[PDB]
Amino acid sequence: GSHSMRYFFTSVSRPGRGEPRFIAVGYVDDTQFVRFDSDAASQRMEPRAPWIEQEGPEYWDGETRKVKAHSQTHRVDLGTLRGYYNQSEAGSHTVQRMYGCDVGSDWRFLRGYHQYAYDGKDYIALKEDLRSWTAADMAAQTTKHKWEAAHVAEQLRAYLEGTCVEWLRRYLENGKETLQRTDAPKTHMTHHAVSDHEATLRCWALSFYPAEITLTWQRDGEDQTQDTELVETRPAGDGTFQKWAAVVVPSGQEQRYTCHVQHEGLPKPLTLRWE
Template identity: 55%
Template sequence: MEIYMLPLLLLSVLVLTETWAGSHSLKYFYAVMSRPELAKPKFISVTYVDDQQVLSFDSDHESQSPAPRTPWIQPDYWERETEIFREATERYRVCLRKVSGDYNHSEGGVHTFQQLSGCEVFSNGSFSRGFVQYAYDGQDFLALDTETLRWIAGNAGALNHKLELEADQSFTKYWKGYIEEECVYWLHRYLENGKETLLGTDPPFLQVTRHTSADGEVTLQCRAQGFYPAEISLTWLRDGEEQLQETELIETRPAGDGTFQKWAAVGMLSGSEQKYTCRVQHEGLPEPVFLKWEPQSSSVGLSVGVTTALLLLLAAVIVGVVIWRKNASGREKRKGLSRRQA
């Protein structure tokens, strides 16, 4: 297997000047896709710092340059990133062709080759962990075990590649150096330049709602919206005990405005709602928040009362208009009769 490596920067010693709350990550997503209608496979890439997309690249874009996704990306990144992405476009097209051939897949078919790589640091900025993973046609292909520096084959088709990589350690050593040094260096730079956004927090807006299904089953839903960063814990408690097996969770989702949303639901018998409490933990909250479902009987009653009053008012207005029109019509008739008599 031929090895195509990213150019390695000369690294300088970075002196940490502050401590950041929580851990932080830098992730690179690469994907190359072939389709019969494409003259060349399409290459795309996105770069994330924590949960914020900061760069993207599309080989079909006329400029052939990365696009900034946040205002604090500095121009001095452009030359370096443009060179990397242009080189990666050709390199991953070669990788897709080689791997497709290993599986005896036609070169003009619909296929994808993907890579996820990156690193995480602790709150003091020191290296926590790194990761390198490859996938082909949506299935695990190869992954680096960063502890043993051995490659894990996702299926039989990747075994030959695993053996070649382990026979020649140069590629593995490159990735070890990259995730522990270069990746950490760039993560520090991103965090410093974007600290007002990346190191800030937005507490969640919280709400507990009650839902009844057609068969009468009651569900309480604990919703968290508008929070940043994405790390959050929603836990349902029954009489103080965690209900992990009974809780239905959705994955944290982006809200489209740089914040996130998530909910957790639990089913129960009607009448036992007050036994349940939702515990919410988030970096933007000084301490855990505990929420119960509160019946909205008073507000419902108020709404019904307001609606009734509005209907009565509307009826009175309609009656008044009818009476006024009748009186006006009577006056017009009397005026016409008086003129004829005159």
């Protein structure tokens, strides 16, 4: 199956409360394995998975320096971007960075990512060819020109295609008991009366990994999409995920509504019915 590694960096400025808040987290497809918080009691990269802990002290001493370097740049980027948009230091602002790589089922490189955001909107992003950038406005083009001279696109392409991928494979092998295992969802339905002539069929899916899943309600084969309550895939707190879909079925028609569940852990897509 396909995999991916992605790191997430959030820097929120505190005007009167001192240095900006910096949070860094790293994932493997849905599994957080590292964290860093500038306000945490530990100023080192802390592990969140058992398979990342088998790395020697040289790994953590290195990843601590790198994550401290990201915080220093975001601390500077906050002031730089504040000047680009001629903004006052009277308020707080948000700088978010995300980068990583995707691999296909053959574990070959599939796509690379490197993106910035300022105050919740896209600021600059590395394009698919891993050679050019996308600059939103003049402030972003200033950054684009600065990164072109520094040869930043070339450094990422060597990392996204060569290091992000190679170390993803190392993480997969070290956590094959966890990351390469697929836990199929446990499906069930619930029936609840809402009126004298209407009822609520809620199609459930719990304890599955990864979080990619698809819940669909059909009526006589037609996809019920406009009238179908769907909730965002939520975490359970132990590593698995949950999701449910609901439709308001008139009394007596429950027999012609069908729920469809698609997931990587299912050999064939499930078709659930009431009665």
